[PDB]
Amino acid sequence: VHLTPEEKSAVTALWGKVNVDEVGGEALGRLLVVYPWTQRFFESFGDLSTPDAVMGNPKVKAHGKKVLGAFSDGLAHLDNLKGTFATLSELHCDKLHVDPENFRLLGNVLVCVLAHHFGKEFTPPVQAAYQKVVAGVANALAHKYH
Amino acid sequence: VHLTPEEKSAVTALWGKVNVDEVGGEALGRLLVVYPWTQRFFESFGDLSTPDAVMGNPKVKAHGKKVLGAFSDGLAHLDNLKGTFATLSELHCDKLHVDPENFRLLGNVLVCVLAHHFGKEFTPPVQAAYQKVVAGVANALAHKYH
Amino acid sequence: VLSPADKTNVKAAWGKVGAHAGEYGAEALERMFLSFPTTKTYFPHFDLSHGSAQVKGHGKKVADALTNAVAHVDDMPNALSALSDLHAHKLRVDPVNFKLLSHCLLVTLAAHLPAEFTPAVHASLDKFLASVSTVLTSKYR
Amino acid sequence: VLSPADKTNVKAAWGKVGAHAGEYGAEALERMFLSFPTTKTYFPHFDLSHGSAQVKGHGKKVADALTNAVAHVDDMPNALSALSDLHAHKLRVDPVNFKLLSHCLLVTLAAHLPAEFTPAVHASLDKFLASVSTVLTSKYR
Ligand code: HEM
Ligand code: HEM
Ligand code: HEM
Ligand code: HEM
Numbered sequence: 001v002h003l004t005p006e007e008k009s010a011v012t013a014l015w016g017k018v019n020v021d022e023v024g025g026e027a028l029g030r031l032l033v034v035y036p037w038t039q040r041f042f043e044s045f046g047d048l049s050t051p052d053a054v055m056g057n058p059k060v061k062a063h064g065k066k067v068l069g070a071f072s073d074g075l076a077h078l079d080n081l082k083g084t085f086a087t088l089s090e091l092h093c094d095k096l097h098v099d100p101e102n103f104r105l106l107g108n109v110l111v112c113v114l115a116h117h118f119g120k121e122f123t124p125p126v127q128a129a130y131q132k133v134v135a136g137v138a139n140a141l142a143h144k145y146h
Numbered sequence: 147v148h149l150t151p152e153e154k155s156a157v158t159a160l161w162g163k164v165n166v167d168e169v170g171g172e173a174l175g176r177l178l179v180v181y182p183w184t185q186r187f188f189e190s191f192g193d194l195s196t197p198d199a200v201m202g203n204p205k206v207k208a209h210g211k212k213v214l215g216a217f218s219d220g221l222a223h224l225d226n227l228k229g230t231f232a233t234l235s236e237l238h239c240d241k242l243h244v245d246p247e248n249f250r251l252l253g254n255v256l257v258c259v260l261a262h263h264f265g266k267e268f269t270p271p272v273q274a275a276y277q278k279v280v281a282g283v284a285n286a287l288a289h290k291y292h
Numbered sequence: 293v294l295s296p297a298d299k300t301n302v303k304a305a306w307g308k309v310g311a312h313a314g315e316y317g318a319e320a321l322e323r324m325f326l327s328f329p330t331t332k333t334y335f336p337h338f339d340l341s342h343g344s345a346q347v348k349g350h351g352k353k354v355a356d357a358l359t360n361a362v363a364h365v366d367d368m369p370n371a372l373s374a375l376s377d378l379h380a381h382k383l384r385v386d387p388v389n390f391k392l393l394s395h396c397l398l399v400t401l402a403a404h405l406p407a408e409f410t411p412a413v414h415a416s417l418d419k420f421l422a423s424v425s426t427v428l429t430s431k432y433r
Numbered sequence: 434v435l436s437p438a439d440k441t442n443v444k445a446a447w448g449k450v451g452a453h454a455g456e457y458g459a460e461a462l463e464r465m466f467l468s469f470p471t472t473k474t475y476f477p478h479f480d481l482s483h484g485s486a487q488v489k490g491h492g493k494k495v496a497d498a499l500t501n502a503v504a505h506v507d508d509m510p511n512a513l514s515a516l517s518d519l520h521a522h523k524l525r526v527d528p529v530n531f532k533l534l535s536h537c538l539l540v541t542l543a544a545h546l547p548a549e550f551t552p553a554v555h556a557s558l559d560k561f562l563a564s565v566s567t568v569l570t571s572k573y574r
Contacts, residue, residue, distance in 0.1 A: 034556040040384035051552040115543035124464040131468040179411040186525040197412040262402040274327040293571035430434035
């Protein structure tokens with residue numbers, strides 16, 4: 001993505017405060033509760049019957065941590081997101097055949113999660129910067145569809 | 147995009163029978179009728195107040211020819227749709243900011259028009275060949291976003 | 293949300309499908325499976341060969357649902373209620389696919405009802421399928 | 434289509450929003466113009482700077498429409514006929530834009546309701562914003 005000098009600074013500053021053991025599961029977690037068809041891809045995870053089952057699900061937390069890790073990688077290579085996400089793109093596009101629209105949904109609820117955590121700190125300018133990232137990432141994950 | 151040789155011939159055969167003076171206008175017109183928000187983009191064409199107005203609009207039929215032409219080009223450069231549309235992607239992405247979903251909607255209405263004109267001749271197999279070209283063009287046009 | 297014009301158009305059109313519904317629903321399906329291979333993941337056990345009697349039988353049920361959908365166009369959530377659970381609760385079908393089948397229904401129609409497939413009707417029909425799709429993709433039970 | 438639970442959820446969260454609706458509606462608009470500047474093309478004559486009294490006022494307006502929609506959840510198409518006429522027919526707003534204000538409104542709520550924005554609330558509020566968007570992007574008159 002683009003990200004101005006002060007933007008990357010803000011993104012970075014905020015991400016430093018992100019809890020890597022929790023946020024990933026919070027996003028993947030809400031992805032499944034809010035966009036229920038996404039659950040079709042995680043049947044092997046166990047009970048996803050209610051929002052409580054989804055959020056408190058061990059595999060959802062453990063997997064989400066990985067998802068969060070892919071994002072962290074992105075943050076470290078904003079000038080090469082497609083390269084950074086090449087492997088994942090093959091996995092999500094050629095293997096799993098995840099419609100690119102969901103890459104966009106995960107990215108956004110992520111933003112909601114970040115928003116839910118940082119509150120007032122997650123300013124419109126800060127959000128704006130994160131939308132750039134989350135858009136690059138999603139586009140990167142969908143590269144194999146282009 | 148990849149079209150089997152047998153596909154490229156079905157697409158090619160069919161397109162040779164395409165009324166190049168009308169098809170593009172039918173497609174552009176239906177886009178605007180079926181997806182009215184796209185009209186905002188062509189407001190300078192004038193009266194588009196109704197379906198017949200849209201389909202009867204001269205600038206629609208006129209501009210449609212350019213659109214069909216673009217499709218003929220990509221159809222002649224399926225090997226390099228991205229480069230072939232680099233200039234159109236700059237226009238539709240950087241200048242107009244047409245949402246990439248609309249590119250997909252137009253390709254699809256083109257497919258309905260082709261079905262409408264060729265009836266039974268536009269067989270499932272032939273359609274599938276066209277969904278490939280069409281999706282490739284949309285992707286090419288959205289390249290400046292990707 | 294359908295205008296009264298839409299209900300008119302849709303009924304005019306779909307009514308001309310009549311006895312053809314099962315066939316057209318089958319063709320739409322086939323068109324879909326051929327055009328968008330991934331849609332096949334929802335019918336893994338299914339015999340999806342060109343003449344598949346299973347496919348033809350299935351499209352009959354799909355096409356009938358649409359007829360019932362058209363009849364109760366002002367009460368699709370109640371009418372399609374069961375199909376909603378099925379697709380949204382049970383099948384967890386990704387909404388995108390409903391856009392593909394819809395397009396395929398539309399292509400099928402256009403290929404078969406040349407005179408009826410006018411821009412306006414094509415417009416209502418799209419909206420209609422967009423509503424059916426919303427209903428079938430919403431969890432409200 | 435909203436489940437009784439979604440409606441219960443929506444009415445509940447929106448109550449929690451209480452007096453702060455207009456504010457949030459304004460913060461949503463701002464977040465959107467910032468994150469997705471293309472949306473600005475729709476408000477050429479507006480002063481879109483941070484403290485914009487204009488954006489603040491349009492925000493109360495967006496919120497009262499939502500509060501109105503929440504109040505007539507079962508009867509939104511009729512409830513919002515005017516606004517639908519405005520957005521769908523008149524302004525022809527690309528429906529892609531609604532997902533953007535919707536997302537910005539959720540993000541706004543996520544940032545202001547650290548104690549009430551639960552996964553369920555988020556989900557119900559999303560489905561709700563989606564219905565609202567479907568109504569305002571439908572030409573049903
Ligand atoms: C920006 C969004 C996304 C990112 C960055 C991302 C990242 C990841 C990563 C890191 C992995 C694990 C790699 C490994 O196997 O070690 C993965 C796997 C997977 N992702 Fe995603 N993903 C994203 C969106 C999605 C979406 C939207 C879906 C579909 C609703 C999805 C479904 C899956 C599945 C099924 C797996 C494999 C899980 C398993 O069977 O163990 N992902 N993802
Ligand atoms: C399927 C992909 C599409 C193709 C093949 C295509 C192709 C073209 C071509 C050939 C031009 C003329 C460029 C020039 O000579 O200056 C053009 C212009 C334009 N297109 Fe597209 N287009 C597509 C989709 C769309 C969509 C979906 C929209 C927006 C709803 C759109 C909006 C426009 C606009 C605003 C112009 C200029 C109109 C004017 O003269 O005012 N196009 N397009
Ligand atoms: C216009 C929208 C659609 C309508 C009207 C429709 C209607 C139906 C009906 C009537 C049934 C059969 C119920 C029965 O036989 O008792 C069904 C089953 C099913 N549908 Fe849909 N459907 C729609 C969209 C989709 C889409 C988009 C997909 C996925 C690509 C899909 C996947 C399935 C599957 C997997 C089954 C179950 C097949 C089986 O296991 O036998 N449907 N649908
Ligand atoms: C749930 C989403 C939305 C709601 C509830 C909503 C509601 C409203 C309301 C209440 C008005 C006031 C009009 C009057 O005074 O009668 C309005 C106007 C307007 N809306 Fe929206 N709106 C939504 C989405 C959109 C989107 C996403 C756009 C486009 C980016 C947009 C663009 C406009 C414009 C340009 C006006 C006219 C503003 C002016 O010139 O004063 N709206 N909207």
